[PDB]
Design a protein around this ligand. Structure first.
Ligand SMILES: [Mg+2]
Ligand SMILES: [Mg+2]
Ligand SMILES: [Mg+2]
Ligand SMILES: [Mg+2]
Ligand SMILES: [Mg+2]
Ligand SMILES: [Mg+2]
Length: 212
DNA sequence: CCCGGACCTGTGACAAATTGCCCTCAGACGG
DNA sequence: CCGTCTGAGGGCAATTTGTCACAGGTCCGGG
């Protein structure tokens, strides 16, 4: 009943490492850009706080640190690499931020597409669970269900999981179980899965889901 | 044969990072 | 001018995320 995010599958499937707060800002950029090619977006502290139920102070802290942490971050489309920002962010007015997204990213944002309402993701905390929920939406049916098999090496490459999750028991305990639990507790989706094996190695995860 | 070895699992510890909270004080504005 | 609503700073303890040692399973093959 809330803003409807839509994005090219190329972003859903891109390789990058962003925090929760950065991904939150990124949804509004994609929304602003889409409602129109200069790459200039803006974020208001007082509106961000209302959208995500934060105080003005903690809103200010999240934006500021998110913004300075974009520096040096890059995005790869499988491959081709780009910087997100081509100028530091800056504040012309108190409570207002202005940002310069790489105009070469515009066609990767708007294209074979993914869509969800912002209320679906705004309570998720772990950013890897946000990645997972975006990739499942890419396969959702009008009625709200789907089934998809994701390869483990591709999950590790695209979501840029940290090195110790290449050991399968650590992958299970700290990524897979936590993110399925968040989705089931924080979104209107109800998710289950099963592991596919080849010899002793586990190679894919097969996800099934329906809507509440 | 049958050991050492190369694989695989899960769990207990600890280290590093993130969470929502709390308090201070100056900016912008309007009555 | 000043009182109030903001937000830009400085911090906190409680949880979560990231890493690795060690117990305990299987199957393989040469000396
Ligand atoms: Mg992280
Ligand atoms: Mg925060
Ligand atoms: Mg023995
Ligand atoms: Mg093996
Ligand atoms: Mg025992
Ligand atoms: Mg043994």
């Amino acid at each position: 009943n809330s803003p409807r995010i839509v994005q090219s599958n190329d972003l859903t499937e891109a390789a990058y490492s962003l925090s929760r707060d950065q991904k939150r800002m990124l949804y509004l950029f994609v929304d602003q850009i889409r409602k129109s090619h200069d790459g200039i977006c803006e974020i208001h502290v007082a509106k961000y706080a209302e959208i995500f139920g934060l105080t003005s102070a903690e809103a200010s802290k999240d934006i500021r640190q998110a913004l300075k942490s974009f520096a040096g971050k890059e995005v790869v489309f499988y491959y081709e690499s780009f910087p997100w920002f081509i100028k530091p962010a800056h504040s012309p007015s108190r409570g207002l931020y202005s940002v310069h997204i790489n105009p070469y990213l515009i066609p990767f944002f708007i294209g074979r597409f993914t869509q969800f309402r912002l209320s679906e993701t705004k309570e998720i905390t772990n950013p890897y669970a946000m990645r997972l929920y975006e990739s499942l939406c890419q396969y959702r049916k009008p009625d709200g269900s789907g089934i998809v098999s994701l390869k483990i090496d591709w999950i590790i490459e695209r979501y840029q999981l940290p090195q110790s999750y290449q050991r399968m028991p650590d992958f299970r305990r700290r990524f897979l179980q936590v993110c399925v639990n968040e989705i089931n507790s924080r979104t209107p989706m109800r998710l289950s899965y099963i592991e596919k094996k080849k010899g002793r190695q586990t190679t894919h995860i097969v996800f099934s889901f329906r809507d509440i």
